[PDB]
C-alpha cells in the first residue's frame, strides 16, 4: 500500500522505516525523530536560527544576533524553491512526519510532552522544510566549513613586518603559517599523485 509506512525498532530502539515513495519514507524518519529527540531538535532549530532568547532570555541575545548575522534565510529559501519534486519530497516529508507526532504531543501533553518542555516553560510548534534544511546548514556548514582568520593573519604579518622588517617579516610569517609543508603526512601517498596548483606566499594583493 502506497500510504503505508512501517516502523520497526530493534533491541537498541533504532528505527527502521519501510515505505514505497520518497515522501512517505522521510515522513517516517521525521516521525521517529520527533519521538526520540524532540526537545533536542527544537533547541537545535532555535540555535540554528537565532531564536533561543525567546525562550531562554537575555543571556542569549548576542548569541541570537550572531547566528542571524552569519546566514541569509532568503537564499536558503530560494534553494529549497528550486528543488525538483523528488528532492522537495525529502524535506517536506521529513517535516510532515515530525508534524504528525508533534500534533499528538500537543493533543495529549499529560503523557507525551517531553519533560524538558515543562521545565523550560514552552511548547513545541510545527516544522517546515526550511527548518530541516537549517539544521544541516547551522550545524554542519557553519560549524565545520566556515573557517577563516584572515583579518587576524594580516594583523600578525603586519606586526611581524614591524618587528623584523618587510622581507624578514614576511619570511617569518611563512615560518609560522606556511602555505604548504612538503613533509606533512598525507592521506594519499606521493606515488599516487600530487596537487597541480601553486599559490602565492608573499601577499601580492597589497
Amino acid at each position: 500500500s502506497s500510504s503505508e509506512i512501517k516502523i520497526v525498532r530493534d533491541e537498541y530502539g533504532m528505527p527502521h522505516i519501510y515505505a514505497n515513495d520518497t515522501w512517505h519514507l522521510f515522513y517516517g524518519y521525521g516521525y521517529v525523530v520527533a519521538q526520540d529527540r524532540l526537545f533536542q531538535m527544537e533547541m537545535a532549530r532555535r540555535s540554528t536560527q537565532g531564536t533561543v532568547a525567546e525562550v531562554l532570555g537575555k543571556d542569549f541575545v548576542k548569541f541570537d544576533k550572531d547566528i542571524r548575522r552569519n546566514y541569509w534565510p532568503d537564499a536558503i529559501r530560494a534553494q529549497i524553491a528550486a528543488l525538483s519534486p523528488e528532492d522537495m519530497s525529502i524535506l517536506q516529508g521529513y517535516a510532515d512526519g515530525m508534524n504528525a507526532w508533534i500534533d499528538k504531543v500537543n493533543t495529549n501533553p499529560e503523557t507525551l510532552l517531553p519533560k524538558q518542555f515543562n521545565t523550560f516553560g514552552f511548547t513545541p510548534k510545527r516544522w517546515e522544510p526550511f527548518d530541516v534544511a537549517m539544521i544541516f546548514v547551522g550545524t554542519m556548514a557553519n560549524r565545520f566549513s566556515d573557517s577563516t582568520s584572515e583579518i587576524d593573519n594580516l594583523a600578525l604579518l603586519t606586526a611581524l613586518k614591524d618587528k623584523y622588517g618587510v622581507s624578514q617579516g614576511m619570511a617569518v610569517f611563512n615560518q609560522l603559517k606556511w602555505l604548504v609543508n612538503p613533509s606533512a603526512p598525507t592521506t594519499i601517498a606521493v606515488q599516487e599523485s600530487n596537487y597541480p596548483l601553486k599559490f602565492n606566499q608573499q601577499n601580492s594583493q597589497t
Partner: protein, 557 residues
C-alpha cells in the same frame, strides 16, 4: 575526527574494513541519530548528526561511506569600500552597488525585544567586527548557494553501488569534507570533497583581498582538482584531519597547520606494523589511538639528545629516561582518577616552558599568545573535543628537526643559544614544578587523568536537555563521539557484510512528564566507555529477528 579504510591487500578474514570516529564533542542526548531507510531507492543503516536526511556514517550492503572534516581553505575575506555619503552602498567594478540588508527582531523571554540590521554584499554577509567608516569585511564561502545541494548530495550518495556513482554525488557536496568509500568486492576510496575558489594569480589566501572587483574569484575549480584516490598501492587510507595530498594547502586558520608533526602518523604505524589486520584488530586501533600521547613521538629524540651526556643522577636525565621506557599509552590507575605513568604531565610542563622560551618569545604581543598552548589544557569536565598537537608544538618541531625540516627558519626560535641548553632548562623547570607537587619519587607520582563529559548544552552552548542530564565518564578517550565499523565480505559470517556502531548515551532522549526516562535513554553509555559496540542491521531478515516493537502508519500526502 579519524578514519581508517583497509582494502583487500591488508584485510585479514575480510575484503575491506572501515572504522570511523568523527569527533564532534560529547553531548546528552547523543550527537548522532541511528536510522535505517528501506524504500524509494534506499536501503541503508547507520547513524547521522542531528538526524539529517542523509546518513554521514553508514552502508547500503554494497558500499559503505564515512567522513572527516577536510580543513581545506574554502573561505576568503573581501575588504569592501564604503563611503559616508552613500550609507549602505559599496564600490564594485567602478560602481556604487547597494548592499542587501534585512531587519531582524530578537524577541526575549522576560526582556525587551531588540531590532538590528544584517548586511550583505556580492561577496557575502558583512562581519560585525573590524568596522570603519571606510571599510567593512565580507566573508566569502566557495559553497555559498550550495548548502541545500550538499545536504541532498549526502542523501543521494547512499544509493550508490560503485565508485563511479558515488563520486558523482561526491562532486555535488560543496563543503570542505573528506568522504571515504568501501565495497563488498574489497575496493576502497577517498575524496577530499568540496567547492574551492579558482583565485586570481597572486591571491595569497591567508590574507584578505580588496572587494573592488579585481580580486574577485574567477570561479570555482573543477572536481578533477579535488584530491582523490581509488585502491591505493599502500592498501589503506588513513586520515585524522591531516593533509589529503602532497602540496595541498590547508585552511587559512592561524591555529591550523599540516606539517611534519601530525597525529595521523599514529594510525599509520599501527596499520603498517602488521601486513594484514582482522576486523577486531582494526577496531582496537580506536582504543590505542584514544590513549596515545601525541607529543612523545615528536620530541623524545630531542629530549634524548639533550640528556645523552648527563650523569646518571641528573634529574633532567631521569625525567627523560622515564619517557624513554614509556609507550605513551595512558591508562587509569585503580583509583579511577590518575594515570599510571606521569608522562603526559612531564610533557605538558616541558612543552609549555619550551614554547614560552621559543615560539612565544619570537612573536609580538599579543599574537604571541596564539603559540603558547601545549595542547593539554582542559577543565574539570575535560576536553570539549579531540586532542591534537598544538600550533606552537608543530612549529617547534620544524625547529628541532634542524636541517631535516623543509621549512626555512627565517628566525632562530632558539635565539642563538644551543638547542640542548634550552631543552635542558625547560627540563629544569619541569622538574622543579613537578617535584614540588608530587615530591621527588617519580615512581609514585599519581598525575590527574583527563575525564570525559556528555554535556547537556549543545556545541552552540545552548541547553538541549536539563543540567542534570549531563553524564560523566572517568577516562577521557581521544576518539569519535561515535564509532562505527563496516566489514565487507567477512569470511566467518553468512552475510556479505557486517556493521557495528555505538551511539551514547542512547538512541532516545525522551523523558515522560512524570520524569520516567525512556528504555533507551542510557543503554549505550557503558558500552562506549569499554570500547564495546552493537550490531547495525540491514536486511529485512536481520531487522525482523531483532525487532522489539513495530507501528504501521497510513497517510496520504
Amino acid at each position: 575526527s579519524n578514519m581508517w579504510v583497509i582494502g583487500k591487500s591488508k584485510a585479514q578474514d575480510a575484503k575491506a574494513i572501515m572504522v570511523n570516529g568523527p569527533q564532534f564533542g560529547w553531548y546528552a542526548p547523543a550527537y548522532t541519530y541511528g536510522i535505517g531507510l528501506h524504500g524509494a531507492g534506499y536501503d541503508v543503516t547507520g547513524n547521522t548528526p542531528f538526524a539529517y536526511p542523509g546518513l554521514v556514517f553508514g552502508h547500503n550492503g554494497v558500499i559503505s561511506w564515512g567522513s572527516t572534516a577536510g580543513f581545506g581553505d574554502d573561505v576568503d575575506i573581501f575588504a569592501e569600500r564604503l563611503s559616508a555619503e552613500k550609507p549602505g552602498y559599496y564600490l564594485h567594478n567602478g560602481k556604487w552597488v547597494k548592499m542587501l540588508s534585512r531587519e531582524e527582531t530578537i524577541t526575549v523571554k522576560n526582556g525587551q525585544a531588540e531590532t538590528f540590521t544584517v548586511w550583505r554584499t556580492v561577496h557575502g554577509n558583512i562581519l560585525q567586527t573590524d568596522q570603519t567608516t571606510q571599510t567593512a569585511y565580507a566573508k566569502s564561502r566557495a559553497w555559498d548557494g550550495k548548502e541545500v545541494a550538499s545536504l541532498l548530495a549526502w542523501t543521494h550518495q547512499m544509493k550508490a553501488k560503485n565508485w563511479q556513482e558515488w563520486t558523482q554525488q561526491a562532486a555535488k557536496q560543496a563543503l570542505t569534507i573528506n568522504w571515504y568509500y568501501a565495497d563488498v568486492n574489497g575496493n576502497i576510496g577517498y575524496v577530499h570533497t568540496g567547492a574551492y575558489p579558482d583565485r586570481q594569480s597572486g591571491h595569497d589566501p591567508r590574507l584578505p583581498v580588496p572587494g573592488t572587483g579585481k580580486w574577485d574569484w574567477k570561479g570555482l575549480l573543477p572536481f578533477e582538482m579535488n584530491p582523490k584516490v581509488y585502491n591505493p598501492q599502500s592498501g589503506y587510507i588513513a586520515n585524522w584531519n591531516n593533509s589529503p595530498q602532497k602540496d595541498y594547502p590547508a585552511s587559512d586558520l592561524f591555529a591550523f597547520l599540516w606539517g611534519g608533526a601530525d597525529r595521523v602518523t599514529e594510525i599509520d604505524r599501527l596499520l603498517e606494523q602488521k601486513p594484514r589486520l582482522t576486523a577486531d584488530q582494526a577496531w582496537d586501533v580506536i582504543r590505542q589511538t584514544s590513549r596515545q600521547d601525541l607529543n612523545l613521538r615528536l620530541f623524545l629524540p630531542t629530549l634524548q639528545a639533550a640528556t645523552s651526556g648527563l650523569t646518571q643522577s641528573d634529574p633532567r636525565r631521569q625525567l627523560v629516561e622515564t619517557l624513554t621506557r614509556w609507550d605513551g599509552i595512558n591508562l587509569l590507575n585503580d583509583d579511577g582518577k590518575t594515570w599510571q605513568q606521569p608522562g603526559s604531565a612531564i610533557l605538558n610542563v616541558w612543552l609549555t616552558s619550551m614554547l614560552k622560551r621559543t615560539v612565544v618569545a619570537a612573536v609580538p604581543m599579543p599574537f604571541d599568545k596564539w603559540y603558547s598552548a601545549s595542547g593539554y589544557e582542559t577543565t574539570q569536565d575535560g576536553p570539549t573535543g579531540s586532542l591534537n598537537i598544538s600550533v606552537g608544538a608543530k612549529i617547534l618541531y620544524e625547529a628541532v628537526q634542524g636541517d631535516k625540516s623543509p621549512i626555512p627558519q627565517a628566525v632562530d626560535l632558539f635565539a642563538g643559544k644551543p638547542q640542548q641548553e634550552v631543552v635542558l632548562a625547560a627540563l629544569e623547570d619541569t622538574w622543579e614544578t613537578l617535584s614540588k607537587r608530587y615530591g621527588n619519587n617519580v615512581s609514585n607520582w599519581k598525575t590527574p587523568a583527563m575525564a570525559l563529559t556528555f554535556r547537556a548544552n549543545n556545541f552552540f552552548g545552548v541547553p538541549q536537555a536539563a543540567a542534570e542530564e549531563t553524564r560523566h565518564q572517568a577516562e577521557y578517550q581521544n576518539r569519535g563521539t561515535e564509532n562505527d565499523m563496516i566489514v565487507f565480505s567477512p569470511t566467518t559470517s553468512d552475510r556479505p557484510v557486517l556493521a557495528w556502531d555505538v551511539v551514547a548515551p542512547g538512541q532516545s532522549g525522551f523523558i515522560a512528564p512524570d520524569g520516567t526516562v525512556d528504555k533507551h535513554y542510557e543503554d549505550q553509555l557503558k558500552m562506549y566507555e569499554n570500547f564495546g559496540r552493537k550490531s547495525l542491521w540491514l536486511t529485512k531478515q536481520d531487522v525482523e529477528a531483532h525487532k522489539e516493537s513495530q507501528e504501521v502508519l497510513h497517510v496520504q500526502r
